[PDB]
């Protein structure tokens, strides 16, 4: 029925809440520890930048761009008058570079 | 027989209603409580996920940039064994073996490509070219005209 084994209803709801909370116990851990991985993303942010920029600063060699290709790569003729099909590093220019204008590339990369 | 707009027949029926608040409370306070907690550790997941992908873009990209030399060419011509002659434009001519993004019938002369310089390897072609006829053309600098240009 309805009304006719209401507390035949209730007990076997309240068991399967009582265990299935406890697998959720261990998604309440999980919450408690991504707080703590958020903090960690920043700092290898932070340092993944780092290296990066040793890389930035000199000694470099200065080309030319000439056109994209995508807007991920880009051509470049280094003024060793040699051509080369380049990466075009993120958080950076993309709206004077595409039109001709000199820029900086590295020597040993 | 019994109703659920109340109960019928008191209390045997009205009894089992009487004793539902004490197993009520404990299911109706866990199942907000613990969906809320669903909800909050999938949202600082998502947060956390936002940070990788920004993070974790930078250090595979290292591969891409420190690579060994690049090196536009053009194909004067296939050959048969597998192997394309390639003149690189700084540079002189090698033969050499391509990848398999491309072969030997999807390449013609005059035809400009990218090199992966593995060992000079072909890797697409490029998606440019400057025709020899518009160079003579450029030159001289033409734009179009129609017969309001003569009119009259």
Do not use: W
Request: proline letters at 3%.
């Amino acid at each position: 029925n309805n009304n006719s084994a209401l507390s035949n209803v209730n007990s076997d709801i309240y068991f399967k809440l009582k265990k299935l909370e406890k697998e959720y116990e261990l998604l309440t851990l999980q919450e408690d520890y991504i707080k703590d991985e958020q903090r960690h993303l920043k700092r290898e942010l932070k340092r993944a930048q780092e290296e990066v920029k040793r890389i930035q600063s000199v000694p470099l060699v200065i080309g030319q761009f000439l056109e994209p290709i995508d807007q991920n790569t880009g051509i470049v003729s280094s003024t060793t008058g040699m051509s080369y099909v380049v990466r075009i590093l993120s958080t950076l220019d993309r709206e004077l570079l595409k039109p001709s204008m000199s820029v900086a590339l590295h020597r040993h990369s | 027989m019994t109703a659920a707009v109340t109960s019928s027949n008191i209390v045997l029926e009205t009894h089992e209603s009487g004793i539902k608040p004490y197993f009520e409370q404990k299911i109706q306070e866990t199942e907000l409580k613990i969906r809320s907690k669903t909800e909050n550790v999938r949202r600082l997941e998502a947060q956390r996920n936002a940070l990788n992908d920004k993070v974790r873009f930078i250090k595979d990209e290292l591969r891409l940039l420190q690579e060994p030399g690049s090196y536009v060419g053009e194909v004067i011509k296939i050959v048969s064994d597998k192997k394309v002659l390639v003149k690189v434009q700084p540079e002189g001519k090698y033969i050499v073996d391509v990848a398999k993004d491309i072969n030997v019938k999807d390449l013609k002369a005059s035809q400009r490509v990218c090199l992966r310089s593995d060992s000079y390897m072909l890797h697409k072609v490029l998606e440019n070219k400057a025709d020899p006829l518009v160079s003579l053309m450029m030159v001289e600098k033409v734009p179009d005209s129609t017969y309001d240009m003569v009119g009259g």
